Symmetry: C2
Subunit: 62 residues, 2 copies
């Protein structure tokens, strides 16, 4: 019944609430994770909170 | 400098400009082709799915939701 989506502190009473939460916030909600999938990147797939930060980060690989 | 290492991409280019344009066009602003499960302790280890529907079915392993 508790959310373990990295960055999420949400705890619930029931499976049905967790299911609705994950669908609402983490699947269909505003995208808040922007991962660099560059092979050997020292971030190790740790997400940025905004696309702009990923764009700036890509200058390090190019 | 010239070659893309974006997970599941092996485009190689002649110039830095070509690589910069490729990354922006395909990996930043292109159709999304990576769907990561950020569930703590997930055995996938943040390895991406190709499609949103695949992440949706995968979530039922963390929730226990019957299909
Ligand atoms: Zn959550
Ligand atoms: Zn990176
Ligand atoms: Zn690429
Ligand atoms: Zn998972």
């Amino acid at each position: 019944t508790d959310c373990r989506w990295d960055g999420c502190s949400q705890e619930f009473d029931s499976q049905e609430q967790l299911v609705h939460h994950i669908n609402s916030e983490h699947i269909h909600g505003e995208r808040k994770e922007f991962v660099c999938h560059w092979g050997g990147c020292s971030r190790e797939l740790r997400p940025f909170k905004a696309q702009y930060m990923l764009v700036v980060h890509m200058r390090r690989h190019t």
